[PDB]
Enzyme design. Structure first.
Site, PDB file in Angstrom:
ATOM      1  N   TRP A 143       0.828  -1.210   0.000  1.00 51.47           N
ATOM      2  CA  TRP A 143       0.000   0.000   0.000  1.00 51.47           C
ATOM      3  C   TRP A 143       0.860   1.258   0.000  1.00 51.47           C
ATOM      4  CZ3 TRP A 143      -4.463  -0.164  -1.971  1.00 51.47           C
ATOM      5  CH2 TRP A 143      -5.288  -1.271  -1.761  1.00 51.47           C
ATOM      6  N   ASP A 161      -1.518   7.056   5.867  1.00 50.53           N
ATOM      7  CA  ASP A 161      -2.560   6.137   5.421  1.00 50.53           C
ATOM      8  C   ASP A 161      -2.851   5.174   6.587  1.00 50.53           C
ATOM      9  OD1 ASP A 161      -4.223   4.219   4.282  1.00 50.53           O
ATOM     10  OD2 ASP A 161      -2.862   3.696   2.645  1.00 50.53           O
ATOM     11  N   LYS A 217     -12.780  -0.556   7.232  1.00 55.44           N
ATOM     12  CA  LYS A 217     -12.073  -1.602   8.010  1.00 55.44           C
ATOM     13  C   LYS A 217     -12.381  -1.470   9.486  1.00 55.44           C
ATOM     14  CE  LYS A 217      -9.061  -2.110   4.159  1.00 55.44           C
ATOM     15  NZ  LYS A 217      -7.917  -1.550   3.402  1.00 55.44           N
TER      16      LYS A 217
HETATM   17  C1  LIG Z   1      -7.713  -0.954   2.151  1.00 55.89           C
HETATM   18  C2  LIG Z   1      -6.451  -0.069   2.042  1.00 55.89           C
HETATM   19  C3  LIG Z   1      -6.372   0.844   1.014  1.00 55.89           C
HETATM   20  C4  LIG Z   1      -7.399   0.790  -0.126  1.00 55.89           C
HETATM   21  O1  LIG Z   1      -8.562   1.535   0.177  1.00 55.89           O
HETATM   22  P1  LIG Z   1      -9.715   1.820  -0.915  1.00 55.89           P
HETATM   23  O2  LIG Z   1     -10.801   2.433  -0.145  1.00 55.89           O
HETATM   24  O3  LIG Z   1     -10.007   0.488  -1.470  1.00 55.89           O
HETATM   25  O4  LIG Z   1      -9.047   2.736  -1.869  1.00 55.89           O
HETATM   26  C5  LIG Z   1      -5.330   1.732   0.967  1.00 55.89           C
HETATM   27  N1  LIG Z   1      -4.375   1.742   1.960  1.00 55.89           N
HETATM   28  C6  LIG Z   1      -4.454   0.825   2.966  1.00 55.89           C
HETATM   29  C7  LIG Z   1      -3.378   0.845   4.060  1.00 55.89           C
HETATM   30  C8  LIG Z   1      -5.477  -0.084   3.019  1.00 55.89           C
HETATM   31  O5  LIG Z   1      -5.447  -1.100   3.962  1.00 55.89           O
HETATM   32 CL   LIG Z   2       0.701  -3.527   2.774  1.00 62.89          CL
HETATM   33 CL   LIG Z   3      -5.336  -5.323   1.643  1.00 64.14          CL
END
Ligand SMILES: *Cc1c(COP(=O)(O)O)cnc(C)c1O
Ligand SMILES: [Cl-]
Ligand SMILES: [Cl-]
Ligand SMILES: *Cc1c(COP(=O)(O)O)cnc(C)c1O
Ligand SMILES: [Cl-]
Ligand SMILES: [Cl-]
Ligand SMILES: [Mg+2]
Ligand SMILES: [Mg+2]
Ligand SMILES: [Mg+2]
Ligand SMILES: [Mg+2]
Lengths: 360, 356
Positions: free
Chosen positions: B101, B171, B195
């Site tokens: 990510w 993030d 999440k």
């Molecule tokens: C789930 C996740 C994303 C992706 O998020 P979307 O809403 O699908 O764009 C980005 N960064 C992290 C750390 C994630 O776990």
């Molecule tokens: Cl990751």
């Molecule tokens: Cl993921």
């Protein structure tokens, strides 16, 4: 309890069966013992929903096989910039027909990104009509021609769509998509926030001619390329799964009532109840739109002065009517009568209007 | 009819939040309309919108000089919106790479400007968080970006670096509001709700106001949304309603410190199971970097991996397959995953080991 009549302009009334269906399975969808909101979008239960929403749309509007249906986040407003970001290339022109405030917002975003043009506009006369297609100023280097099928704030609507062959025809159909039959192959792309006539907020339906836009545009962020979403079937990143689910449920309801053709008959009938009330009011109510351009989705009108406007709207709100205040930018009144607004709400509004008039 | 929801995104939600949603789905707040049928300019919606912000502010103790935004497009759109707004000419988007990510965020910045890698554990397949003393920072950094919880690799920042030359940006998609946070360490925090906070469809962005613009599209300016309190265009009203509901549940159980206690017990159950398995289960992360949110592990070979995951599925567990990019197994134990589900997982892990 007391009566509630939902004339909200966006988000708006949903068909009860779509909501009752969602409620019943909210905790346990498709026997998974999970909410559809708790599923992976890679699960078979979710993918079924995602595919069904696409297939219902395809069947209902008879979308050709060379078109793809995208489910995107960001609202129609994001499409105002995504469209010129993908198609408005150097040397080309984003040509707009202005028929209300939403058309101006679309134009403004293209102005940020390239050459724009105004093909025709009724702005001078306060957007009371759709201009004649013969007035359209077209350019050989137009990237597209952009229209607003239903001018949500002003209460006007295209009766039919221009034949355009020099550039793709693009339309913001947020407030009248699937309120009637449509010849999709007149267009290169159609987009609509779902929250006016297709269900919940949070997803935007984009029907696109695949070959106009399935190619990588150099220098455009991945999320802002149509190609990204076409290639990944709108599963590039996590989709708005509950919104798409509710969209599915609403589409099922449209199909169940006979489709676009049947809902058009219903929508013409409800609209007629209100416009006849205006037209038999001897000027007590004055519709904004010219008669040839009257929208079937948003009925805009004023009383003879602002005081009567306010008393009418206060009386409506006391009697259970929701959402009748006109858009903040224009004042007056706006009866939004999208697909799911029931006809007895329209009858109720007529009753309100007649007694207010008689008692004024 | 037993089901254990270890989905990694979207994910389990609190039962009381979903039950509350169900109960009033047709008649919200005595309006006789669904929350889904309300205008976003209605007071009815506006109170919910504000209540969701208020709960986040309380629960994370977000200072007054931060604004809370509710945006669409997921964390993925933030990957480009951030440099679009802050990666100005002559500045650098500096990234700490601690998983895939991280990589995806850095990629979007490379489209828009100069980038740099402050540090990276990629060489060692992202088994750990790098030592902050290792970071390579630049006078002209526009920001330093990190991924607090590396969802695919199962590692997580234990604490955050003290960065004063540029805003720290995180993030936090897979660990936001799973534990107390010092929000003042950051210039911006962002997370898809799906999440720890709610269903998919809304992205929470916590931004130092004064931190954040000619030529950026209106919808892609943070200023647009700050100025309009995330009501510039139609927000994802039902997702924000559900976010409120989830936040009420977290508040009700005692807040960020209380949920951290639950989360640490959940993670403890699985990691102890792995550690006590004598090499039968092997965790991917170095101990010191173990995530409390995504527990990644594998069996001794691919066939046992597969036999385990099949047995899991048959026994009602959902989502334990590792990310396709890394394989193995992944137990996502975000806020609403109950302790009982982790206990069930443990018991399955132990029985499987015994029967192999
Ligand atoms: C789930 C996740 C994303 C992706 O998020 P979307 O809403 O699908 O764009 C980005 N960064 C992290 C750390 C994630 O776990
Ligand atoms: Cl990751
Ligand atoms: Cl993921
Ligand atoms: C509601 C509306 C919009 C705005 O849609 P958002 O999803 O709020 O961005 C754009 N165009 C038209 C015609 C609308 O009626
Ligand atoms: Cl308009
Ligand atoms: Cl509108
Ligand atoms: Mg049917
Ligand atoms: Mg009735
Ligand atoms: Mg409470
Ligand atoms: Mg021990």
């Amino acid at each position: 309890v007391k009566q509630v009549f939902n004339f909200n302009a966006g988000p708006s009334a949903l068909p009860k069966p779509a909501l009752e269906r969602a409620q019943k399975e909210l905790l346990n969808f498709n026997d998974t013992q999970m909410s559809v909101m708790e599923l992976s979008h890679r699960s078979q239960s979710y993918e079924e929903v995602h595919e069904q929403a696409q297939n219902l749309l395809r069947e209902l509007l008879q979308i050709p096989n060379d078109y793809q249906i995208l489910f995107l986040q960001g609202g129609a407003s994001l499409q105002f910039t995504m469209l010129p970001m993908n198609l408005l290339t150097k040397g080309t022109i984003g040509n707009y027909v202005l028929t209300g405030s939403w058309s101006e917002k679309a134009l403004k975003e293209a102005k940020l990104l390239g050459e724009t043009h105004i093909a025709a506009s009724t702005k001078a006369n306060s957007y009371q009509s759709i201009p004649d297609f013969s007035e359209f100023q077209l350019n050989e280097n137009d990237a597209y021609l952009h229209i607003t099928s239903n001018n949500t704030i002003y209460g006007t609507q295209y009766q039919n769509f221009p034949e355009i062959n020099h550039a793709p025809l693009i339309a913001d159909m947020s407030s009248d998509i699937l309120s009637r039959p449509l010849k999709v192959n007149q267009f290169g792309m159609i987009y609509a926030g779902a929250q006016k006539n297709l269900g919940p907020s949070g997803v935007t339906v984009v029907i696109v001619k695949k070959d106009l836009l399935n190619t990588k545009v150099e220098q455009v962020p991945t999320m802002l390329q149509y190609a990204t979403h076409i290639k990944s079937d709108s599963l590039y990143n996590t989709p708005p799964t509950f919104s798409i689910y509710m969209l599915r449920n609403v589409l099922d309801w449209i199909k169940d009532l006979g489709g676009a053709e049947a809902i058009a008959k219903q929508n013409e009938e409800k609209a007629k109840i209100i416009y006849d009330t205006i037209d038999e009011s001897n000027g007590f109510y004055v519709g904004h739109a010219e008669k040839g351009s009257r929208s079937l989705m948003n009925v805009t009108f004023n009383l003879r002065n602002e005081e009567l406007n306010q008393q009418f709207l206060a009386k409506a709100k006391e009697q259970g009517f929701v959402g009748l205040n006109g858009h903040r930018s224009v004042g007056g009144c706006r009866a939004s009568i999208y697909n799911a607004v029931p006809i007895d709400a329209c009858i109720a509004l007529r009753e309100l209007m007649i007694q207010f008039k008689e008692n004024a």
